[PDB]
Amino acid sequence: FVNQHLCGSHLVEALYLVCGERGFFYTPKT
Amino acid sequence: GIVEQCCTSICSLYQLENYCN
Numbered sequence A: 001f002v003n004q005h006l007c008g009s010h011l012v013e014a015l016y017l018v019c020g021e022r023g024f025f026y027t028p029k030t
Numbered sequence B: 001g002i003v004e005q006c007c008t009s010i011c012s013l014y015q016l017e018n019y020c021n
Helices: A009-022 B002-008 B013-017
Strands: none
Touching: A009 B002, A009 B013, B002 B013
């Protein structure tokens, strides 16, 4: 599910699944 | 940043993990 174009909620979903309990930061303007 | 690498271009696990805490 990671090796494709991921935009919007689809990208934050991928971050959520990959990063697990570590969590993540989503900075679309940076 | 993440949008350029993963939305505009094709994403990768390597890149996603750069945004994990």
